[PDB]
Amino acid sequence: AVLGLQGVRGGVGTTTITAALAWSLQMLGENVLVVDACPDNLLRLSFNVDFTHRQGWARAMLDGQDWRDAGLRYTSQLDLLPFGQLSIEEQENPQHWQTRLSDICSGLQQLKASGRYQWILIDLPRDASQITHQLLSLCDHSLAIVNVDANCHIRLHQQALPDGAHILINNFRIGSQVQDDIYQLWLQSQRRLLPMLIHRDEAMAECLAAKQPVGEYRSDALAAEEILTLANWCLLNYSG
Amino acid sequence: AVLGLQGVRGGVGTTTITAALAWSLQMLGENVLVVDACPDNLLRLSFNVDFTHRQGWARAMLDGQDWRDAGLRYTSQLDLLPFGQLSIEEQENPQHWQTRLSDICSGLQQLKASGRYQWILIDLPRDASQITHQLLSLCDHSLAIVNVDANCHIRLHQQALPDGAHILINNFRIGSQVQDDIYQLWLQSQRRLLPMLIHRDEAMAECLAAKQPVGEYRSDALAAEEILTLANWCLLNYS
Amino acid sequence: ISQREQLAAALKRWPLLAEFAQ
Amino acid sequence: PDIDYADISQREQLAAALKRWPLLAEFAQ
Amino acid sequence: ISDIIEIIVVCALIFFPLGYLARHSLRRIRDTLRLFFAKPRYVKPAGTLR
Amino acid sequence: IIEIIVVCALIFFPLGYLARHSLRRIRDTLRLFFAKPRYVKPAGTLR
Amino acid sequence: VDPVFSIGISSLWDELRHMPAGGVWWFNVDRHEDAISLANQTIASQAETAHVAVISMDSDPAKIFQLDDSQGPEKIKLFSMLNHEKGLYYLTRDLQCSIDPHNYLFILVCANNAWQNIPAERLRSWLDKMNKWSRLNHCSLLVINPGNNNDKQFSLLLEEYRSLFGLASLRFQGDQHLLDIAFWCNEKGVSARQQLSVQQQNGIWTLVQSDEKRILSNVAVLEGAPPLSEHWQLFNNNEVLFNEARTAQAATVVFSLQQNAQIEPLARSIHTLRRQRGSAMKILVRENTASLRATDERLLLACGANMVIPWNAPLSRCLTMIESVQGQKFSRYVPEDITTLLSMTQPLKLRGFQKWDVFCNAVNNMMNNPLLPAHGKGVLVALRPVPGIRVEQALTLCRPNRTGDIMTIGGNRLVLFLSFCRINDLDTALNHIFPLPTGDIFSNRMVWFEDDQISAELVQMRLLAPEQWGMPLPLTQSWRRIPEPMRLL
Amino acid sequence: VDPVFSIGISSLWDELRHMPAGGVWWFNVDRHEDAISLANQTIASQAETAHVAVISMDSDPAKIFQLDDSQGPEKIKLFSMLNHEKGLYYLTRDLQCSIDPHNYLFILVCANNAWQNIPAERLRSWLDKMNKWSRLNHCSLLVINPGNNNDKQFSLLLEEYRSLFGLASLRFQGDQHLLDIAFWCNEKGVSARQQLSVQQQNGIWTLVQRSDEKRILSNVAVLEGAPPLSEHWQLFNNNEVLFNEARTAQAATVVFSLQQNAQIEPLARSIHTLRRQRGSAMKILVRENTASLRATDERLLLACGANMVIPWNAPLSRCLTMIESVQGQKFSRYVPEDITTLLSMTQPLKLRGFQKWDVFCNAVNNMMNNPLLPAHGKGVLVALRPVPGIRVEQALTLCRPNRTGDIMTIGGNRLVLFLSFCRINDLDTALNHIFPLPTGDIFSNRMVWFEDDQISAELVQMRLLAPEQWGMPRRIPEPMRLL
Ligand SMILES: Nc1nc2c(ncn2[C@@H]2O[C@@H]3COP(=O)(O)O[C@H]4[C@@H](O)[C@H](n5cnc6c(=O)[nH]c(N)nc65)O[C@@H]4COP(=O)(O)O[C@H]3[C@H]2O)c(=O)[nH]1
Ligand SMILES: Nc1nc2c(ncn2[C@@H]2O[C@@H]3COP(=O)(O)O[C@H]4[C@@H](O)[C@H](n5cnc6c(=O)[nH]c(N)nc65)O[C@@H]4COP(=O)(O)O[C@H]3[C@H]2O)c(=O)[nH]1
Ligand SMILES: Nc1nc2c(ncn2[C@@H]2O[C@@H]3COP(=O)(O)O[C@H]4[C@@H](O)[C@H](n5cnc6c(=O)[nH]c(N)nc65)O[C@@H]4COP(=O)(O)O[C@H]3[C@H]2O)c(=O)[nH]1
Ligand SMILES: Nc1nc2c(ncn2[C@@H]2O[C@@H]3COP(=O)(O)O[C@H]4[C@@H](O)[C@H](n5cnc6c(=O)[nH]c(N)nc65)O[C@@H]4COP(=O)(O)O[C@H]3[C@H]2O)c(=O)[nH]1
Ligand SMILES: Nc1ncnc2c1ncn2[C@@H]1O[C@H](COP(=O)(O)OP(=O)(O)OP(=O)(O)O)[C@@H](O)[C@H]1O
Ligand SMILES: Nc1ncnc2c1ncn2[C@@H]1O[C@H](COP(=O)(O)OP(=O)(O)OP(=O)(O)O)[C@@H](O)[C@H]1O
Ligand SMILES: [Mg+2]
Ligand SMILES: [Mg+2]
């Protein structure tokens, strides 16, 4: 199945959780393909890819090449599809290339049928763009990554979550009265909340520094175990 | 004058810092106007503006009204120009209204030439929108807000800051090894980094819940003092 | 009853929660 | 932006920081 | 004659260890005699002066 | 007869007594005669 | 396992007093009354569980021997014998008939010149038999012989050292008895040829009867390390050291200060020592991590300390300075009232921004106090803002941290008075009382650190129009606030 | 009637010199030669009608013991016994068998450290039996014991003072010898705890007619600028003139100072010379100022005669307290006369670099079987199993020894390291020093052997490996096409 990850706000931990979840799902004896559609292109650097490597499916289509040749093999049961680097001229003028990336949906669909991968995780930004909407629609299920703060509390009551998406709490902290109050309010105000939450674990902060997923970098850390529980939940509930 | 605060990555605290900076400058006796360029309309909620207040300069411009009537006066020395809550359909297709907000640049030029406002803070998004590029163009100074972590460090080597911007550190922890290493490397490598940094404080997380700027919420807060120092620094250099 | 009392205390303490609550 | 990566290996603490974390060293070359 | 010599030898043989054990156990015999009654003369106990 | 046997007692009982009284002398003389040095071997009285 | 008994002599060391069970000891005395008293003291000197049997001649022991009602064994058993040699020969058999000799002490009291008729060879044989008997039965025998001319017999006893575990003599010398121990053996060693004197007081034989280099320091003065030398005496805390200091007259005292709270008690104690035990003493203070500022160091110095060692200096230098202060009398004057010195440590007692008149009056009074050092009272700093920012904003930019820091705004000049600051470390204080940019806020500074300069500057500052006197922005500028709509023009 | 015999010391008063027949006297000696010379001088010391029986071990008594041509008894008995406990036990009966042992003198000269193996209870029993035998026989026995670590034995002898009749000890002190008479009983009286100094001239002992125990001799560098700490404190510039002044010293305390690597051998030699010339009354301490000492060097100094070596981590007055700790203590440990055998133990391997399986096994076994090495501290044997994805040759390439005692060997998909004189606790530091990359990303499992039996078992298990199994010198994503 195709599981799409998108955050209610940039920087809540969507890419880190995407890499960790892909690593965990693969460790459970499963072929996993993780695709970064967020143009920031920060999912690569969690998988020990050289920074100078500018190859990516978006870049492959922007140069007229084949997007499929941009694939990477991390382990025998984990694959990567880098977004690719965009020039400063490309970064400051997003309209000139946003509409030229629509073809990727058909390739993702044909891959979803290839039967090669049992999970297709997609890291999506919150730019409300055409590509983001098309890729979120392609996903069989969705995960919304939030943190327990006032900003996400407001965003939950003013912006539209993906249809049927599950709220996943990330970056839960220790000794914050406001965080506890908002969590209590969500326990009965929100029906889509997942039973598992990822804590503020220093392993998560270091994992991108080490260019490794949190499961590989330090499997004894609480964050790795929480991501493991989330992977089990995806297996048991998001099978179809 | 026109001090644009923009986050290098979302969630660093551009909005709460902007509210705090507005409050600190208004304590210093300067005429301050905060204009929310963020479409998510969180700046209004920080100045005790009710969630139901749909009015805003962008909504007024789309609806053909005069944005000059969309403001609120918080104290004698602080004015707000909220973005205005947009409908769900409007949020789904931003490309249908991004190009229709051109006159705000002329209005801000008029306000700058007015001289009534010695400071005009602008809370900006990071979406590469044409409106945001224009707003940065009319800004006299820019502050890029980063957090000390791998994400911001990676961004700083690949995404283009506004020209002349100064990097401000927010959400600084105590005893994080990767954070300390990145901080030292930043000190010895980043030329534009500001001498002040804002520590993580429960005051900043509680200010938005109380719908007040962090300075008014608790003036003894460490982040409040840091924001006041930043305001004085802007007075000294950005004037 | 403890959870409800804590929720009411928080709602009284933080007006942003009270605004969306009702 | 403004980055001055020259003359980095002249400091011990920065050397330890670069050794510990591959990403920082990768940027510093 | 021969039997007389034999009997003399027998008597000597029986009586040599007799005196050997008499001297060997003399100290024990004297101790037992002292134990029984002996004669606690000269030094006399006066009394238990508490 | 019996008298001579009793007289033999007045010779061998005192014999056994004096012989026991010289037990140390007898032992010393026998050790001198048999002369069994098991570990201490006199190398020789030097001049 | 077998108990060790003791001779009845007071103030006697256990080397010459303990008598292990299984030996023979001989005592010779000059007087029979002295013999009886010594015997009685031996009787009453034994433990409750000790077994004692007494052998005397020519008298009834039940009437002449006494026991103390407070100390001594529960009961003793006596033996009476005619003054005859055959009793001495048969003693072993006679005691075995009535007493089991295992772990028993036997006292052999003899009459006057009782041991004169016993020949030398028979005496030696008797001693040998007694020694073998004691070794077999694990018992101790005591013989007290009153005699006058036993020189030949004493020489024979000396020749019989194998069979005697100890030989001692006691002679009357008018007012004291002289105890001469030829040889003594016990479980604590062997001693030979000692002469001691014992005196008879109320029936108790009793044995008869500057700090310029001694170093008194706290144990914390030597972290972990035990004393350097014998005179180096360590103390756990700086109160036992103080208490001992009341007995010294010229000693070297080194106190230890690890916390700032322990400053007032330490200074007061140093004051007391300088006021009580004369000027021959030397008082020192040794820090541990960080406990003193300049002003408190001056307080300690005036209190009576000759030299204060900073925490930076290593211990070797501390001992070196200890040896350096050797010849140094304290010649300064210490006032009777410690309150004056305690008051000298802080004369301001007011913090933060003040009114211009308040600032001038407080600063002038502190500069007018005679009980303060000259040209070290404090620093008066005038700051003129960079034309980018005004003066009230600069006032909002400074957060003084100490009790003696006060500020004002007037004539476009923010004034700072840092009490008890040196000119060399002015920048450190300014960096602590401002943001990190060291004085970048203002354009120029004017520093005055001398009393004449400060007083003249205050006089000049008094000549200002009150209209230009400022007040803080947070107080003047200042529940929830509801925004009200308004038109932007 | 029975004559008294005299110990062979010139200028000695008869109180501590006469020994009447019928008792037991014990004498301990610091060196064998002083003991033997004392034996010969006692030999010449007896009267013409005096009869002396001499007992020798592990040699011929007719070759080493002589007699003076002018003085001494006319005829003495030379007896030879095997160096075993049974000879000493049978001594009485063996002497009775060939001699009527009444009113005879008995000299007991044993070999070096001959009394060390006798148990305490049996020693007490033998002393009691000798005492009874002598008293019954009216004969006297003299025991002359060369020994170094008899302090516990001396305590036993003090506890058995009834059996003995006199105890004295002789200590070599460079130029003279100290006679310490704990107690001596004879026909002329009893003396207790007498200390005297005697000297040797051409094999003849003379009494010279404690004194410097309090005095402290130390280097200037020991006290980091501290002045003389008391009247008994003297400072010297280097540990050379200090050695010369300690030559004059008898019971003082010497505190050496260690600055650099090169000082160890001259200091070892000087300590050896002092501890051989002067006995256990000296207190020798080595102060390390700078971290330039090995543990083997500290063991070497301890064997040379140093009480202990104070670590540089400790502060100054802690070193002074170390000095105060050895006060009243005697160096009872044995120091070999040969010094080169002490330095030969510093590095007995002297082989560096890659070694073959057989060569490595032979070298480690030879080092393990060396008797002159500390027990359970010869070295540490480490077996490393490389992580999957890398071979043993790559690990061998990334492994650079730094000390002389390092050897490496790859075999059976396993890398074996042996570190000479390394301790179990300080193993990760050595591994970090050798390996360039941190340990943990190169090997998965580690087995450590540091005890003698464990290392020997590992060596004999490694030898049962067939040839052709020995050895001699973060994931990277790869491109692929999605299909
Ligand atoms: N009014 C004021 N003056 C300041 C301040 N910081 C530094 N100074 C001035 O600068 C001198 C140097 O202090 P330092 O280098 O911080 O080195 C200081 C510091 O390490 C320590 N110290 C003294 N008082 C305190 C205190 O209250 N807290 C702490 N944490 N350390 C202190 O003692 C050292 C000696 O300082 P002083 O003898 O007092 O002499 C001080 C003082 O004259 C400040 O916050 N306020
Ligand atoms: N580095 C430095 N910082 C300075 C100095 N003077 C003041 N400060 C700062 O100001 C704070 C308040 O110190 P205070 O009001 O003098 O009140 C001080 C003072 O009464 C006492 N104290 C702390 N350290 C020292 C010290 O070294 N000497 C003395 N005499 N008192 C000290 O504890 C109080 C609290 O001090 P802190 O908790 O450390 O926090 C101190 C410290 O952070 C200085 O000379 N150097
Ligand atoms: N960090 C560290 N490195 C170590 C250690 N042991 C050996 N090394 C390294 O190995 C090199 C050679 O030491 P070596 O073969 O024992 O040969 C050594 C040894 O013979 C001698 N030496 C050095 N330090 C000492 C010491 O403290 N005691 C003694 N007795 N000899 C020493 O000098 C030679 C050269 O040594 P270096 O020039 O220092 O160069 C040393 C050093 O870089 C150690 O414990 N820690
Ligand atoms: N084979 C081998 N084993 C090593 C090496 N480095 C450390 N070890 C082992 O680890 C222990 C700790 O040494 P250290 O912490 O470096 O502490 C060292 C170091 O601080 C210093 N040291 C001694 N020799 C040298 C030398 O040659 N070079 C340097 N740089 N320091 C030395 O003295 C200490 C002596 O350590 P030890 O007591 O011998 O005990 C050493 C040794 O058993 C090494 O390079 N090779
Ligand atoms: N549970 C957690 N504990 C600690 N740090 C976390 C946790 N989750 C995420 N982070 C950290 O938060 C930072 C931002 O996360 P990340 O970049 O993955 O989020 P994002 O929403 O994909 O951001 P963006 O889209 O803006 O690039 C990273 O430094 C990451 O290590
Ligand atoms: N110094 C700080 N200490 C603690 N919390 C902080 C700090 N700065 C910001 N925050 C918190 O971080 C969160 C993000 O702040 P803010 O809403 O201003 O972010 P932003 O970068 O403007 O983007 P967005 O509006 O999309 O969240 C808020 O919950 C805020 O309270
Ligand atoms: Mg991301
Ligand atoms: Mg915002």
Numbering used by the authors:
A (entry chain Q): 2 to 241
B (entry chain W): 2 to 240
C (entry chain V): 39 to 60
D (entry chain R): 32 to 60
E (entry chain S): 4 to 53
F (entry chain F): 7 to 53
G (entry chain E): 5 to 213, 223 to 491, 505 to 515
H (entry chain D): 5 to 213, 222 to 485, 506 to 515
Task: Give the exact sentences the study uses for this entry.
Bacterial cellulosic polymers constitute a prevalent class of biofilm matrix exopolysaccharides that are synthesized by several types of bacterial cellulose secretion (Bcs) systems, which include conserved cyclic diguanylate (c-di-GMP)-dependent cellulose synthase modules together with diverse accessory subunits. In E. coli, the biogenesis of phosphoethanolamine (pEtN)-modified cellulose relies on the BcsRQABEFG macrocomplex, encompassing inner-membrane and cytosolic subunits, and an outer membrane porin, BcsC. Here we present cryo-EM structures of the E. coli Bcs macrocomplex positioning all seven BcsRQABEFG partners and multiple c-di-GMP-binding sites.
Finally, we visualize the complex’s intrinsic conformational plasticity, in which the regulatory BcsRQEF vestibule, and BcsE in particular, can resort to alternative protein interaction interfaces to maintain the activating BcsRQ partners onto the synthase’s cytosolic modules even in non-saturating dinucleotide concentrations. Interestingly, the remaining particles showed a c-di-GMP-free BcsA synthase and a more extended vestibule conformation, where the central BcsEREC* domains engage in a different dimerization interface mediated by the pairs of β1–β2 connecting loops (melted α1 relative to canonical response regulators) and the C-proximal α-helices (canonical α5). Densities for the PilZ-proximal GGDEF* domain feature markedly lower-resolution, however, the conformation for both BcsEREC*-GGDEF* tandems is still consistent with the closed BcsE state and intercalated c-di-GMP complexation. The overall BcsE fold features a more extended conformation along the NTPase*-REC* domain linkers, neither BcsE protomer contacts the cytosolic synthase modules and the X-shaped BcsF dimer is found shifted near the fifth and fourth BcsB protomer as opposed to the c-di-GMP-saturated complex shown above. Nevertheless, the BcsRQ tandem is retained as an apical complex and the synthase-proximal BcsQ and BcsR protomers engage in similarly extensive contacts with the catalytic and PilZ modules. The specific BcsE REC* domain dimerization interface and overall vestibule conformation would also be likely influenced by the lateral diffusion and BcsF partner stabilization among the synthase-distal BcsB copies of the crown. Finally, we demonstrate that through a composite, interdomain c-di-GMP binding site BcsE acts as a higher-affinity dinucleotide sensor that can adopt discrete dimerization interfaces to maintain the activating vestibule components even in the absence of direct c-di-GMP-BcsA interactions. Processive substrate addition and product release by BcsA would thus depend primarily on minute movements of its gating loop and finger helix—as observed in crystallo in saturating dinucleotide concentrations for the catalytic cycle of the R. sphaeroides BcsAB tandem—rather than be absolutely dependent on direct synthase-c-di-GMP complex formation.
